[PDB]
Amino acid sequence: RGYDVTRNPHLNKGMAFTLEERLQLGIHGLIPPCFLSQDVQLLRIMRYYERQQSDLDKYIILMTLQDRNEKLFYRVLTSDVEKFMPIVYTPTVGLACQHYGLTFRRPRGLFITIHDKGHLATMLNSWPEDNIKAVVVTDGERILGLGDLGCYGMGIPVGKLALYTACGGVNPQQCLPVLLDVGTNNEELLRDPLYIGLKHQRVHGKAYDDLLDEFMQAVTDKFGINCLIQFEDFANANAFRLLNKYRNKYCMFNDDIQGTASVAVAGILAALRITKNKLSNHVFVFQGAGEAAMGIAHLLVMALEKEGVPKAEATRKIWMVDSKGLIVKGRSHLNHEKEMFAQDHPEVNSLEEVVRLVKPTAIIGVAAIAGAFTEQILRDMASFHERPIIFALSNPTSKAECTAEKCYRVTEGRGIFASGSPFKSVTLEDGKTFIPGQGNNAYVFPGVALGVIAGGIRHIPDEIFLLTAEQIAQEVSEQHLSQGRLYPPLSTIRDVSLRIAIKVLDYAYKHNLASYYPEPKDKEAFVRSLVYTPDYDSFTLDSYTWPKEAMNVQTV
Amino acid sequence: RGYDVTRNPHLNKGMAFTLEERLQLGIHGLIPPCFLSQDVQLLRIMRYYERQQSDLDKYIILMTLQDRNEKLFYRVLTSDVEKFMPIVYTPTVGLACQHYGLTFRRPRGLFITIHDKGHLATMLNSWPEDNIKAVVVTDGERILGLGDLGCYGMGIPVGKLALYTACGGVNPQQCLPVLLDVGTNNEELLRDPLYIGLKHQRVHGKAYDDLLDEFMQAVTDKFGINCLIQFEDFANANAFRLLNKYRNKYCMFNDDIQGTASVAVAGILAALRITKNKLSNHVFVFQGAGEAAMGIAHLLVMALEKEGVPKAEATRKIWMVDSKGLIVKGRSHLNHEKEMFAQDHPEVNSLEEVVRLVKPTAIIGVAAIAGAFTEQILRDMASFHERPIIFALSNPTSKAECTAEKCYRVTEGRGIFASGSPFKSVTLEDGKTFIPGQGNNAYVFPGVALGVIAGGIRHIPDEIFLLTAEQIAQEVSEQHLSQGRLYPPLSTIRDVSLRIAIKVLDYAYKHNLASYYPEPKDKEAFVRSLVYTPDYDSFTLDSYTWPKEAMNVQTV
Amino acid sequence: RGYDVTRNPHLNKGMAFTLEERLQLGIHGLIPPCFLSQDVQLLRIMRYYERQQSDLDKYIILMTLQDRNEKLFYRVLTSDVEKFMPIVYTPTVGLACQHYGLTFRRPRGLFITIHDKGHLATMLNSWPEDNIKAVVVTDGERILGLGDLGCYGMGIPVGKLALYTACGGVNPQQCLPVLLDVGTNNEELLRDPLYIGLKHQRVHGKAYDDLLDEFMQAVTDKFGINCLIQFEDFANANAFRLLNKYRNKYCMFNDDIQGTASVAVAGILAALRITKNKLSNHVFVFQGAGEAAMGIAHLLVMALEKEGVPKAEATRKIWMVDSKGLIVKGRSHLNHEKEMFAQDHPEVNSLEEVVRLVKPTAIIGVAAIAGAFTEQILRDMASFHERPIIFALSNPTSKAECTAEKCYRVTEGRGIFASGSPFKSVTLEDGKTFIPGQGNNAYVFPGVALGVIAGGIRHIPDEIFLLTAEQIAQEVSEQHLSQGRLYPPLSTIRDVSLRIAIKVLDYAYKHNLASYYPEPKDKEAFVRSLVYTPDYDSFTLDSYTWPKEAMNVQTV
Ligand SMILES: NC(=O)c1ccc[n+]([C@@H]2O[C@H](COP(=O)([O-])OP(=O)(O)OC[C@H]3O[C@@H](n4cnc5c(N)ncnc54)[C@H](OP(=O)(O)O)[C@@H]3O)[C@@H](O)[C@H]2O)c1
Ligand SMILES: NC(=O)c1ccc[n+]([C@@H]2O[C@H](COP(=O)([O-])OP(=O)(O)OC[C@H]3O[C@@H](n4cnc5c(N)ncnc54)[C@H](OP(=O)(O)O)[C@@H]3O)[C@@H](O)[C@H]2O)c1
Numbered sequence A, B, C: 001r002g003y004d005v006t007r008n009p010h011l012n013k014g015m016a017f018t019l020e021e022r023l024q025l026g027i028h029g030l031i032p033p034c035f036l037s038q039d040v041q042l043l044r045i046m047r048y049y050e051r052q053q054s055d056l057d058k059y060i061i062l063m064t065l066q067d068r069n070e071k072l073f074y075r076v077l078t079s080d081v082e083k084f085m086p087i088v089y090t091p092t093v094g095l096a097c098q099h100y101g102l103t104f105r106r107p108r109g110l111f112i113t114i115h116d117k118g119h120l121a122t123m124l125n126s127w128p129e130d131n132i133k134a135v136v137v138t139d140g141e142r143i144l145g146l147g148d149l150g151c152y153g154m155g156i157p158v159g160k161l162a163l164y165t166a167c168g169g170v171n172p173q174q175c176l177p178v179l180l181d182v183g184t185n186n187e188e189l190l191r192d193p194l195y196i197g198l199k200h201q202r203v204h205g206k207a208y209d210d211l212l213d214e215f216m217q218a219v220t221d222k223f224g225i226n227c228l229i230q231f232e233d234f235a236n237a238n239a240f241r242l243l244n245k246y247r248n249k250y251c252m253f254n255d256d257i258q259g260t261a262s263v264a265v266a267g268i269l270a271a272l273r274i275t276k277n278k279l280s281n282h283v284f285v286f287q288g289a290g291e292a293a294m295g296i297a298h299l300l301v302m303a304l305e306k307e308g309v310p311k312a313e314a315t316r317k318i319w320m321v322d323s324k325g326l327i328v329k330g331r332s333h334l335n336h337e338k339e340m341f342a343q344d345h346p347e348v349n350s351l352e353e354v355v356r357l358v359k360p361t362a363i364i365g366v367a368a369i370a371g372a373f374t375e376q377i378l379r380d381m382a383s384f385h386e387r388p389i390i391f392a393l394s395n396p397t398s399k400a401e402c403t404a405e406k407c408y409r410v411t412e413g414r415g416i417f418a419s420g421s422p423f424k425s426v427t428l429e430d431g432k433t434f435i436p437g438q439g440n441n442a443y444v445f446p447g448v449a450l451g452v453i454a455g456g457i458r459h460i461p462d463e464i465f466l467l468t469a470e471q472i473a474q475e476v477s478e479q480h481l482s483q484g485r486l487y488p489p490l491s492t493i494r495d496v497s498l499r500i501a502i503k504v505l506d507y508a509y510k511h512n513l514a515s516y517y518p519e520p521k522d523k524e525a526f527v528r529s530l531v532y533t534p535d536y537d538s539f540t541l542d543s544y545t546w547p548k549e550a551m552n553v554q555t556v
């Protein structure tokens, strides 16, 4: 291999190459003469990492470490995943993508543009690894609420793929981050000279659709029909349209639509363990008719049907509010997606009145509208139903409809709170401590992706996401439930991911969805054999010896 | 690529590289300055080929051409497959393996020994290609009736794999010929200084079984559970034992046992189109209780059961003779394999008396006993039943129980003759011309392997071989049947193979055997897209161009 | 390295790779499981080699062996160089080039055409090895008296380069055979469909000259000014013109012009040890005014001047005959090259009269005119001077002006005979046995090239060829001289080459011609360290170990 094995981040072990490995690889002298363990390398990386002030500097450190030594990169991540998930992925990856071209030093991933239509097979051949299982493609049109970042959005798939491996166990060498650059509508990037992008307006219409059709066709031609393809950060229209288009053709799933739904429903089912009742006797108010809200409502209707509730009566438990009030009889703008959860009721001005009108047991806020949950709302909630459920899922801590402390005070410490952004612990009256859980999509897609890749699941129906939500809800301990924590601690997410994979494996084998033929009897060991570990592999050559009568050199 | 693309027989096009391809590959100057077509290269190879006298020289020419330019090699083969099948495979490959080490110049295939137990994964990693679909492993213990040739037997898988691609359409780059060298019992090779082998007696018992277990495990670990593994030229005991062992664990099949059966039953079903009756009203006498005879009898019993005949009454139509006479009540040596077709009858001395005793409609000779079919036998055959069936399947033309002319004379030109060795046309009384067909295993395994590889069929049950026999029997034209030709002409075998593949594909999709998930609606086009053609691929790089406003170099 | 180290003839050891080497190279399994010595491989090659009938088959065997295992190829050659020099080089290489495209299977060397002018640097980059010392370029215009063979002539440089390594010690990996294809005038090849060539008439004039200028410029740009460039088998006009053009610009030499001269003068100086006199008292008659004759005459004039003879009186000892008679006062066609050795004498009809007119002590026949040396001539020679010298140097044994037996009879066993073609021993009257030596160019260019490459000699003046002739003449033993053997036996040529190299090294260091700076004190050991040996190198990796306190893995 030689000098090339040190420029390969999947093979490069740095100073952890033993002397024997350096001699056998032809890289002796290229490494300093110290032989470290991954622990000492981790200590060096940590000492250099803590010496930064801004989170962008830490992100840059981690990304350079990923380009240098991937096993050490994932050792850093899995070292304390709860502290490195905010850096490698949201929210830090957002400000990273905002200033991508500024700090952009090494290109990561695969950039496929609209002007490449017809030649995507070759561009996929540009990628070094040819055994690819997962593909996180992104469009750049709607990133982390920052909006259209265009080709700057490459940090989002890359970052997300880290969570595939750090959180789940997906072998990072089988993961390919793609960015489909169809232009950008961000005028700030159309004039930015540092914009590493395409610098014209978005190509939309049939050209964009043909580009994505060919992308799916080419990805599955080169890597197989079992290649899991996750769509990430597409526009609402495009997100749902392409989800319904390639839902049943490829192993495609969209985590903004389905991972959000799965984690929200997991939180709701976990709160059911606190309320001590059935999902049937809950009525849900949504504070948005959005991409996340529709997904959460659809998976919630599915969870209600699974409990033995007809489709119409289950839908009649979901009330939504979209910038105008409750979605009602042909009100002013309801497209066919809001028509489904439309209630047959007089029109309501705002959320704060429809909470009183239809007293809900569980309110869910997905609008990125800060302060939408008033003191009035939470007070009347705790008055109507004992132990109400509040889900301020808005991603930016600023945009949260309600904070932990506000909800816990106004509900007199009697409301199950959960959020999308981390609110730390809350102490109140009479020493009631609450640890408001953080509904993180990382609870869903790592284990789901691990199970799909393990079993070669051909398609991801909504039932997989529902049983994933059920498994996540079962992951929470009784002790944690006593503290209002609706989700398992992220320090265990790896195990959680495993326990999801096995489960989504069983389902796929009982519904004839898996393609891995010799169906493993012990699916846990099967999935564990595929969980990528940051531990270093040995690069030494096995030198065995034949008996010294079959290996003798003939001198006749 | 450079100089390395001319030492790769799969990529090397010789002087057929265009000037543009040579400039783009970095090999300009390494090729003489003439630009040929594959036709002119074929003419050169043919002019050099016809200038040899012994068939071993032609075999050496073809094998060197395979090591040089594989697409030209298969162009030579598919140019006239009926004249190059005897050279690349039996019978010429037999005398080639007999004098292998003598003319041995370039090692072909993969040599895995008994002393490599535990390290077969690395030896499989030695093979350049990593996308392997077919694996023809051989043992060397029983080659072409020449007996134990040991490691000299590597010509048999290699040669056979050529028929996978020349006869069928299997991409030769996905084929791996293996030789399991466990030693040899041929004392002639234990002292031959030119023996490229292991030079001790055969390792047998549990060591050999563990070696083969690990071989199957390692082949399917590296290349997948869908890797078709054909066992070839094993000892009778080992052949049947390993066939029944890995029958349902891997995509294994043994062509000496199952391809022989399939082609013999195909001949019988084709002769049914001449006799104009059903298989039920036929009684079969076998002239051997052997590896081929048992297989033919089992597939024939299956074909009878398919026509609506119980298992016992179907078995009661098969009479066998093994060196002692008819297999009867506990006669002297009947192991459990001959017990199945044992008839409850008084013991018979020889075949020539049991033909008179049980007058058969169809006699099959598989004993390599020359002249076993006497004038007496064929005469009384043509007397008992009008239009009898004679199958002198013994492989060496010398060992044939009966010749074409003898059978056609004694049966007064009224007997369907078929043989395993080529007997050319026969003219007789009253201008009756007969073209005695040659039952060749190449009718079976190329199309079966093509369909298995196309559909990723997990296992090969006997029903695939039976429907293959049926398809082969349907391949024969009415005109050819008027001439006593029981098998389709080999000049069409490629198409025949295709028509088998599609068929063995349909079956595999209606019995949930195929693993290729997006089941093709048009299976013919699907299989045709995988049929390897000798035509040269273009090595030029596709150079497209973005619109001249997205590809402009920024000079700010 | 893997599978690629077995397709590289310089690295491929065949079955001589030990088990450890196969495991360390990643080629275990690709080789049969026998471990041979180069002796056993030599035995296999010899057993397969002796089973051919025509010399062309043996040439093809050796050339395939060269393409497979180069160290075994040169082991075969140096095994008995006297029996493989006729096969790899003249005369067999001539009939090989005549039927090149017929048996052409693997392209060898570098084909540079006239239509490549401007891009020869890239074509030189096509060659795998980048450390090239020797370059035998050929034109194809005059090959071995067969005439214009065009691009078929590639066997001549390749073959000749074998003699660089088998006879001398030149590392074959540093040798590059080139063919400059400027077309061909052979109408037989312009219509031959198997002609691997350019198929138009020769490009001549300034285009050809610019092509060769750029060839020299590009070869020395890529490989250095020290790259020895031997011109071989050019047309007489082109041969001499380009020799005088690039004589002092590059390390160029032409062996048809200068190697012929060196070996002929070596024979003459050796015969001086039999005549027991000085070169000054010899008068020489040449039977040709040709490319070889002019060179021999010029080097002979130089040898006479070295003995203390003025230029004019030395030239006045050379008499030549060219198809018209003695070259005399402005006779009919004398170009400026024949003007030099023109004698001021009445015109003579034929050679047989000018031998009587000017009675010579030494006659040299270079005209390819069979029988030019009559019984009359040799008789009057032995009558005029006691112990005369006859040099029937014509290359084809058919074209020899005189045979060994004829000369030895007519001279009553008193004439030093030497020829260019092998005449075996001669017994005569009174048991006088003579071993007529064969003046072979292989006595000259291997050792000269070895010394030039060793010392990096910048230019090859005629003095190097003269001292080479002197060393060759000193190589002959007194015992061999008693038998009329003028040249050392070829079984010692390797040592001879060494003894020439060292000598041509000393000269180059005492005339400031060598470029190897740290001038070796022991030049013999220096040249021996560069003599390529067919012995196999070890491919194992050296695995040393640091003290077990500097190599311990830090776990802090
Ligand atoms: N796991 C997680 O924690 C997670 C995951 C994903 C998203 N989220 C959060 O959830 C939110 C979902 O947004 P999205 O991008 O999926 O959907 P979106 O496309 O942003 O749609 C937002 C919806 O909210 C409605 N809305 C806007 N202003 C409102 C107001 N003042 N009162 C009531 N409703 C209002 C809008 O209705 P109109 O149709 O009238 O505009 C719109 O349909 C995001 O802001 C994100 O922060 C959390
Ligand atoms: N496609 C084809 O055309 C094709 C394919 C494969 C094979 N073949 C031919 O068919 C033959 C099958 O041989 P195999 O290797 O498969 O089986 P095998 O192991 O050679 O067994 C041969 C059987 O014939 C019996 N036998 C021996 N001598 C006999 C005699 N004088 N009279 C009657 N029976 C006798 C033996 O019975 P015991 O048990 O008493 O020894 C033995 O069981 C081969 O010789 C081959 O030439 C043709």
Ligand SMILES: NC(=O)c1ccc[n+]([C@@H]2O[C@H](COP(=O)([O-])OP(=O)(O)OC[C@H]3O[C@@H](n4cnc5c(N)ncnc54)[C@H](OP(=O)(O)O)[C@@H]3O)[C@@H](O)[C@H]2O)c1
Binding pocket: C145, C236, C256, C260, C263, C287, C288, C289, C290, C291, C292, C293, C321, C322, C323, C324, C351, C365, C366, C367, C368, C369, C372, C393, C394, C395, C396, C399, C419, C420, C421, C439, C440, C441
């Ligand atoms: N080491 C060796 O043993 C060695 C090496 C090289 C060559 N040779 C032999 O030496 C010969 C040299 O030929 P070359 O190619 O170097 O020169 P060339 O170009 O073949 O010239 C041959 C010369 O011989 C003259 N000639 C032709 N016919 C004649 C006749 N009937 N009587 C007298 N002279 C005649 C011609 O003179 P015009 O000018 O009047 O035509 C011509 O100049 C070759 O044939 C070759 O066989 C031997």
